[PDB]
Amino acid sequence: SAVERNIVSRLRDKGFAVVRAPAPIPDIIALKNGVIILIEMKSRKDIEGKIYVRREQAEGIIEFARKSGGSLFLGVKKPGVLKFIPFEKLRRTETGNYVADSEIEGLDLEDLVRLVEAKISRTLD
Amino acid sequence: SAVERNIVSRLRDKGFAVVRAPAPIPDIIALKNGVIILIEMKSRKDIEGKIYVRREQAEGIIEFARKSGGSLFLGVKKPGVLKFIPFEKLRRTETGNYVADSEIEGLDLEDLVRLVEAKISRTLD
């Protein structure tokens, strides 16, 4: 919640129109000049130390991303920095839940925004 | 609220990923395959019988539409049918408030969805 609010505010300072899902929809929906990004914040840690997204939540947000045509990301708060993982890098486990392996480390906020800004540029050009 | 809920449900039956602004953001944010539409529901009627959007609300949602790159519409519930007016057809009055003149009559839901579907088609092709 503290982290969500920080992320919304920084995306709004960076020019995005943002909405938080009301209390399954991605936690954060952020729009900028025609581009849609969807951010699910640090769902959880299983008994092996891996951040995970439970089955039904993962499927709800993957379907919201598929219909919207929006790019979906898992955001993970670290006592260090914020990392965003493209949902497609998560691994569907044997139980249908989704886990982030460690190597990953996603994008920082600037990298994420830059992905958005490059898509805007292709559309303009 | 009754009308908002109906509209969300019908847009979701039509393939959109939809979010309601939490209790200024457009009431309805609807996404489908890369296209963003923003719907503000039947703000109000002034002493001359015209549906209006107050200054600060209108400016908040116009700015949300400008940053998102989303198409903004005023939806008006009628004891008859639902009409959607492209926000650009509203008239800025002498006081900075926005009113819908009568002639207007916007799009029905199918027409609105068709605008969305044609933009998807141009992007695909």
CATH number of A70's domain:
3.40.1350.10
- A112 contacts A103 by C-beta, under 8 angstroms: no
Read off the amino acid at residue A61.
I
Residue found under tokens 């990923």: B17
- In chain A the first and final C-alpha atoms are separated, in Å, by 38
Nearest to B43 by CA among B103, B85, B95, B94: B85
- A42 contacts A3 by C-beta, under 8 angstroms: yes
Whether B105 has a binding-site annotation, put simply, is no
A72 in reach of chain B (CB within 8 A): no
- A36 contacts A73 by C-beta, under 8 angstroms: no
Distance from CA of A33 to the nearest CA of B (A): 4
- Token couple for A58: 């993962």
In the 8-state DSSP scheme, what is residue A103?
A: S
- B83 contacts B67 by C-beta, under 8 angstroms: no
- Token couple for A57: 């939540």
The answer to whether the Cβ–Cβ distance between A69 and B32 falls below 8 Å is yes
Long-range contacts of B23-29 (CB under 8 A, 24+ apart): B23/A22, B24/B56, B24/B57, B24/B60, B24/B61, B24/B64, B25/A17, B25/A19, B25/B60, B25/B61, B25/B64, B26/B61, B26/B64, B26/B65, B26/B70, B26/B72, B28/B4, B28/B75, B29/A19, B29/A29, B29/B70
Sequence-ordered list of residues with C-beta below 8 angstroms from that of B71, at least 6 positions apart, any chain: B35, B36, B37, B38, B65, B86, B115
Identity of the residue in A16, A63, A69 whose CB atom sits nearest the CB atom of B67: A16
Q: Domain range for residue B30?
A: 1-125
Q: What count of Cα atoms within 13 Å lies in the side-chain half-sphere of residue B80?
A: 5
Number of domains chain A contains:
1
Phi, psi of A92 (to 5 degrees): -75, 120
Which experiment gave this structure?
X-ray
CA–CA distances in Å: residue A28 to residues A13, A69, A87: 15, 15, 14
- Token couple for B70: 């989303």
Buried b (16+ CB within 10 A) or exposed e, B15-28: bbbbbbbeeebbbb
B3 in reach of chain A (CB within 8 A): no
- Token couple for B82: 């639902």
3-state secondary structure of B102: coil
Q: Which of B4, B20, B29, B31 to mutate to test the interface with A (most CBs of A within 10 A)?
A: B31
Distance from CA of B47 to the nearest CA of A (A): 33
Bridge-based pairing state of the strands B71-77 and B82-86: antiparallel
- A28 contacts A107 by C-beta, under 8 angstroms: no
- Token couple for A16: 């995005």
Distance from CA of A62 to the nearest CA of B (A): 11
Nearest to A26 by CA among B31, B64, B6: B31
- Token couple for B18: 């939809």
Distance of alpha carbon A15 from alpha carbon A47, whole angstroms:
39
